[PDB]
Amino acid sequence: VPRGSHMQADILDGKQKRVNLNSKRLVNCNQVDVNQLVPIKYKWAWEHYLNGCANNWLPTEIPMGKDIELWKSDRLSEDERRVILLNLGFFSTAESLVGNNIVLAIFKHVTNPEARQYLLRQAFEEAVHTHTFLYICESLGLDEKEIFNAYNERAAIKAKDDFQMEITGKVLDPNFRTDSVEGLQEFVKNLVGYYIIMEGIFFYSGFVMILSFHRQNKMIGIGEQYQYILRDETIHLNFGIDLINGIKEENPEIWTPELQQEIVELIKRAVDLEIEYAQDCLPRGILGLRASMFIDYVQHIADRRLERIGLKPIYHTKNPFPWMSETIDLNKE
Amino acid sequence: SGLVPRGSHMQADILDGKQKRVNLNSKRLVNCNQVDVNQLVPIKYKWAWEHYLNGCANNWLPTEIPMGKDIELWKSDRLSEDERRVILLNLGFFSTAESLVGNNIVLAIFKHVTNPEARQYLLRQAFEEAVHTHTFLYICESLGLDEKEIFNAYNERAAIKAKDDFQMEITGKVLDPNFRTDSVEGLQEFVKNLVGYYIIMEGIFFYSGFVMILSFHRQNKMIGIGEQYQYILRDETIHLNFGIDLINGIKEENPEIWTPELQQEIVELIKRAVDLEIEYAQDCLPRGILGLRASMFIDYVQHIADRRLERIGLKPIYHTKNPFPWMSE
Ligand SMILES: [Fe+3]
Ligand SMILES: [Fe+3]
Ligand SMILES: [Mn+2]
Ligand SMILES: [Mn+2]
DSSP: OOOOOOOSSSGGGGGGGGGGGGGGSSSSOOSOOOOOOOOOOOOOHHHHHHHHHHHOOOGSSSSHHHHHHHHHHSSSHHHHHHHHHHHHHHHHHHHHHHHIIIIIHHHHHOOOOOHHHHHHHHHHHHHHHHHHHHHHHHHHHHHHHHHHHHHHHHHHHHHHHHHHHHHHHHTTTTTOOOOSSSHHHHHHHHHHHIIIIIIIIIHHHHHHHHHHHHHSSHHHHHHHHHHHHHHHHHHHHHHHHHHHHHHHOOOOGGGOOOHHHHHHHHHHHHHHHHHHHHHOOSSSOOOOOOOHHHHHHHHHHHHHHHHHTTTOSSSOOOSSSSHHHHHHHHHHO | OOOTTOSSOOOOOSGGGGSSSGGGGGOOOOSOOOSTTTTOOSSSOOHHHHHHHHHTTOOOGGGGGGHHHHHHHHHHHSOHHHHHHHHHHHHHHHHHHHHHHHHHHIIIGGGGGOOHHHHHHHHHHHHHHHHHHHHHHHHHHHHHHOHHHHHHHHHHHHHHHHHHHHHHHHHTOOOSOOOOOSHHHHHHHHHHHHHHIIIIIIIIIIIHHHHHHHHHHHTTTSSHHHHHHHHHHHHHHHHHHHHHHHHHHHHHHGGOOOOHHHHHHHHHHHHHHHHHHHHHHHOOOOOBBTTHHHHHHHHHHHHHHHHHHHHHOOOOOOOOSOOOOOGGO
16 A cells, blocks of 8 residues: 555544454443444444345335225235234334334443444334335325324233333433442333234234235235334344343343343233234134234244244244244344 | 215224324423323424424435445545645544434434424434445445544543534533523523534534635545545535524524523634634645635634524624535535
8 A cells, every 4th residue: 555545643632532342242241432333342232234235216206096096905804904903003103112212221231332333224224115105194194183192092912011101210310320230130121012012922922913914915005014024123133132142141140040030021011902902903803813812822933933033932833924924034134 | 175074083992092192382492391202293393393304304325335446546646745634633523423413312312302393304314424434434444534533632632622622512512411491590501502413513614615625626635535525524514404494483482492692602612712723724735735724714714604504593704705616516
């Protein structure tokens, strides 16, 4: 390289602020400069970021003409409409709950620039997901306030989001810190609540309901949007699992039998709430969909989430939706 | 526009829940605790939603832009020491500036912008800052620069540090866990943060840099870097427009905060930013390069400062001409 290809320092004291890769930590890292991306330590976080960036899509790119025609017709049963409406109601605000939590709760305490890069991509993706639900409401001529207010008006939805508020913990409190054992444990419970429970269990169950319509060639515009959402959420979940496991590895003292058991109990509570939600969606069942299938499915996926964070499966049920894993394989990171 | 079909309404089983549906006229940009901030609808601030849609339409990645010709030129003796200095100082400053801006959106601004459509835009903007950060890593890796030397520039170069230190100062107490915007004093402090990041950092401190880098691009030098900066400029144009709309919106809804005292303080902050940016330009350009001299930046930085002032309802103060009119093409 030619002469003059280096920045010359005129503050010699400042070279000390260059970041030692091995000093970097996922949480509680105040000893190095968090504003400098380099050198990247958590290559897994950066890879998630690059993968997410390659997945750009917008709901407005997906035509809704056939969906509008079907929705406005008399072809759908009231029970079919009920599944769609309840799913829209729950997702319309749940995306914002997730996005707001990334920004208002998680970001401050993930003291690492490459992980934060991913968080910014994820949060933007949640904004895209929120746009999706606005777009669907406007396209089909739904009462947008009725749909977006569903979590205040439908008990089985409220129950899930009230639980979400509970497991959010005090992470939003101005006094909240992660530099105690109890504090970092509370933080990890928040991560489990959002990545494992909301994104990894509540959302996957909604995906089955909606994609079951897509597979029947009903509401294929909504279906396609949900396929893109599933592709994003696959990465959200993978990142969250990696982050939880990373925090555990770097802070083994938090991973007590007590914390482990509580995480199991939260997942159990999520499973029960999602089953009750599925029953509210499907009081009689529709073509290809019964509540009993969600009992097995929700238990199955909960076992898969438990395994990924080093906990034993507890339900041992089989997956009644083998095709979900087919589209999951196609939408794999 | 077809008829609403029978059975197409979601039935409530919590009868009083309907009261939490959001009244459009109750929404506000700050201090809005009377309605549910989680529900996007109904959208009140159309300008915020439009910025969001515009940003989303602007997707790009630095890895899409070929660096072959740039690598070839960087290896050659066809780029002078002085030209290299301009490039490296700009890479040094921008490499961390993007993170400063992005971190401030998330850690300072988002909590206090109590409006979902504006928050939708903020998430787009913060992601764009991540793309800009990626851009500087990609440039470093492409040209084989010492990445730690580049990203640490704001700790190693006085003229860069001076800008970023001033930035830390105008960030104010907004990061204080117990900072609140629900007083005149609190909201004025918040507005100073918005001026500091949108107007000063994004609207002024990026501009000598844009001119310098795009000057190379216009001479067919480092066109890979140039193209990346063109995409950054496109994004930053929206960032600035959103910030101006946000500042003006907060003023309109809370006119009592916009005192002669605050107005004077903002002008003085902008004057100081101008001085610091002129000094930075001087550091970049101890000697002239083609179509670029440090003295030109006196006129330019003052000219853009006047333009920013006008946009937030303040009188221009410098009255200088723009030596780089091609920046508006
Ligand atoms: Fe998600
Ligand atoms: Fe910006
Ligand atoms: Mn989502
Ligand atoms: Mn930027």
